[PDB]
Amino acid sequence: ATSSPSSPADWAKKLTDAVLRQKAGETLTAADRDFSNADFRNITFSKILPPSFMERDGDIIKGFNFSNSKFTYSDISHLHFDECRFTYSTLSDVVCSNTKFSNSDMNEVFLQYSITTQQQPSFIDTTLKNTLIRHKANLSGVILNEPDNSSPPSVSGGGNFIRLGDIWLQMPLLWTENAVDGFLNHEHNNGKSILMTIDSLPDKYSQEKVQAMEDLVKSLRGGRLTEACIRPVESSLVSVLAHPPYTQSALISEWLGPVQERFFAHQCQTYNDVPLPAPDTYYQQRILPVLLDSFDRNSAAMTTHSGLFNQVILHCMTGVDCTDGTRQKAAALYEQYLAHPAVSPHIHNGLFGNYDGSPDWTTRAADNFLLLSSQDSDTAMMLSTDTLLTMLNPTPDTAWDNFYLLRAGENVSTAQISPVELFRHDFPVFLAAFNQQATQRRFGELIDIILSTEEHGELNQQFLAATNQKHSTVKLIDDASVSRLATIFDPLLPEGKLSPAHYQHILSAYHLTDATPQKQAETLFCLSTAFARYSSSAIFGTEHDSPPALRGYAEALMQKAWELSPAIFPSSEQFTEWSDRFHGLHGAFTCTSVVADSMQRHARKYFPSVLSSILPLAWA
Q1: If you write DSSP's letter for every residue of 347-400 in order, what string do you get?
Q2: Helix (H, G, I), strand (E, B) or coil at 487
C-alpha cells in the first residue's frame, strides 16, 4: 500500500520496495510515493538499499512525499533525493555525507545535522524556507525567497539566529576558541565554514550574501576577542571577505580593515626571514591578492620587509592558479619597489631584467629580482625567477651560487665566500632555506643508513617522501609492512637497545663524533620524536594501529639519550611514562600521536635550536 505505520524498520522496508520498483522501470502513483509522517529514526540506508543507490551517479530516490517525517539520527550519506517533499521534517543529527537534494521542497525543516558527517550535503534547485541548517553546506543551487514574518525556530540552546535569504543559521552564543574554529576556520576544517557556506550561494544572490555576512560580522564584532583568539582565523576571514562582493559592504570593509592589517603584520613577522611554504590553489586564489593589497596599502613594508615582499611577488608571478589581475598587480607593485631610493641604485644596466631598468616577466630566466640585505644598506642580491623559486623551496640538489651579489654599483665576486656565511650576515630567508636543505640531507642520510636503496627501494622512497607532508596515504600496518619493518629496525636494537655501531653511524651523519654528551642526547631525543611521528596516525600509523618496529626504534633512541645525558629530560618517570606508551603491553589499544606531541613540546622548550635542525620542517 506504500504505507506502513510501524517501526523505523517497517517504514524503511516499504520505501526500499517502492524505490526498487522505481528502479525496475515501474511508474508509481502519487499514493505509492506518499511517505508522510514516516519514521526513519536510526536507519542506516546504505544497509538496506542496493549499492547503486550510494554510488557516484548511481540510482536516485525520485518523487517521494516525506512531509513531517523523522530522519533523526539516520544515515542518508551518499544518497540522491530528487523531486521530494521534506516540509516539516526533522533531520536533526542525521549523517548526510555528500547527500544531494535536488528539485526538492525542504521548507520548515530542522537540519542541524551530525558532525560525524564528512562531505557537506548539497542543495540544487531546492528551497529551504524557514529551515534551520548547520552552517556547513553547499548552497550553490538553492532557491531563495523573501523572508517572512516568522520567529526563529524553537531550540534547546545556543546563540542568536541570522537570515541567509529565507534560511536560518544559528550563531554561537560566545565566540570561544572552539566556536571560532568550528564556524570560521575552513583552512583547518577541510574547506568547510560558515564563510564558505554563505559564499557558495549563486552570484544572482549577491545581495543576500552580503546581508548574511554583515550579520555574521555584527555577531563577531558584538563581543569580539583580541589578537590571540582571531589569530587562528585571520587567514580564513580575509580569504573570503577581502574579495567581492564583500568589498562593496561599508560595514564589512570597515571591520576587515584592522583584521587584514593584523594578518599582514603577522605574515611580516613570520615569513620575512623564513621561506613561505609553496602556495597551493587556495592560497594563490584567495590569500596572495590580499597580501598584494596590504603591500599596496602599506608601501613602506615593501623595503622594510623585502624578504616577505619578494616571496609574495615571486609566487604571484609563478603560481599556476594566480589570476592575470594578481600577476599584473604584483608587477605594478614591484615597479614601485624598484623606484624606491634604496632599491634603484642596485638596478644595474647590463644585468637586470630587460636591461632598461625594468624586469622581463615573459621569461623565468631573466634576472627580475633584487633582494636588499637585512643588515648592510649598500648590498643586494640579484637572481632570476627560476633561481629564486629553487632557493626558497630547496631540493636535495639545489646550488647556492646562481645569484649575483651587488654593491657599490658593481657585480661583486662570490668566489672565496661560502653561501652560508653570506646568508647568515645579509639574507636570513636563505640561511633558513640553506639550513632546511641541510637538515633534510642529514635525515635522508639516516634513512639511507637504516633503509638501503638497493634492498628496500620502495620503503626508502616512502620514508623520504613522508618527510615533506603533514599526512600520508601510505599506512604500514598490513602484514607485509609489519614483517618488512621488523627486518629493518629490529636488527639495529639488540636487547631493545640501540646497537653501538648504529649509534656511531648516527654520530657521523650528524657530525657529533666530537660533540658533548648533551648535544648528542638532545639530537637523539629529537630523532626519537621524528620516528614517533612516523609511527603516528598522521604518517604510517592509523588511529588504532602504530607499527611496532617504528615505536621500538623511537623508544631506543630515547633510551640512549637518557643514558648519555639524563639532565636533558624533565624527570625520572616522565622518561618512564613515554617509554610505556611507546610499548605495547597489549593494554594500549588506541592512540598516541600523543607521545610525539608531548616530546616535541619539551624539545621546543629546552632545545628548540636542536629540534629545528633535526626535524623535517613540514612536521614542525
Answers
A1: --TTTSTTSSSS--TT-SSS--EEEE-SS-TTEEEEE-HHHHHHHHS--TT--S
A2: helix
Q: From 358, 354, 361, select the one nearest 328 (Cα to Cα).
A: 361
Q: Which of 96, 229, 526, 591 is catalytic?
A: 591
User: Is residue 490 within 8 Å of 526, Cβ to Cβ?
Assistant: no
Report the side by side order of strands in the sheet with 132-133.
110-111, 132-133, 167-170, 161-164
147: left (phi over 0), alpha (psi -120 to 50) or beta: beta
d(CA 526, CA 23): 60
Angle among Cα 309, 312, 315 to the nearest 5 degrees reads: 145
Resolution (A): 2.1
Number of Cα atoms under 13 Å in the Cβ half of residue 539: 26
Q: Quick one: residue 78, left, alpha or beta (phi over 0 = left, psi -120 to 50 = alpha)?
A: left
Of the candidates 294, 293, 354, which has an alpha carbon nearest to the alpha carbon of residue 329?
293
Residue 405 DSSP one-character state: E
Give me the sign of the Cα torsion angle 201, 203, 208, 211: positive
Rounded CA separation 134/140 (Å):
15
CB-neighbour burial class of residue 96 (10 A; exposed 0-12, middle 13-18, buried 19+) = buried
Domains of the chain, with CATH numbers?
1-157 (2.160.20.80), 158-352 (1.25.40.300), 353-427 (3.40.1850.10), 428-620 (1.10.4140.10)
C-alpha cell at 462: 616512502
Instruction: Please give the method by which this entry was determined.
Output: X-ray
Q: What is the DSSP string of 526-590?
A: HHHHHHHHHTSTTTT--SS---HHHHHHHHHHHHHHHHH-GGGSS-HHHHHHHHHHHS--S---S
- Three cell numbers written together for 91: 533531520
Pairing between strand 379-383 and 100-102? unpaired
Cell of 7: 517501526
Q: Which helix (H) or strand (E) holds 433?
A: helix 428-450
Q: Is 526 in the active site?
A: no
The gap between the terminal CA atoms of the chain, to the nearest Å, is: 63
Tell me how long the chain is. 620
CA–CA separation, 398 vs 394, rounded Å?
6
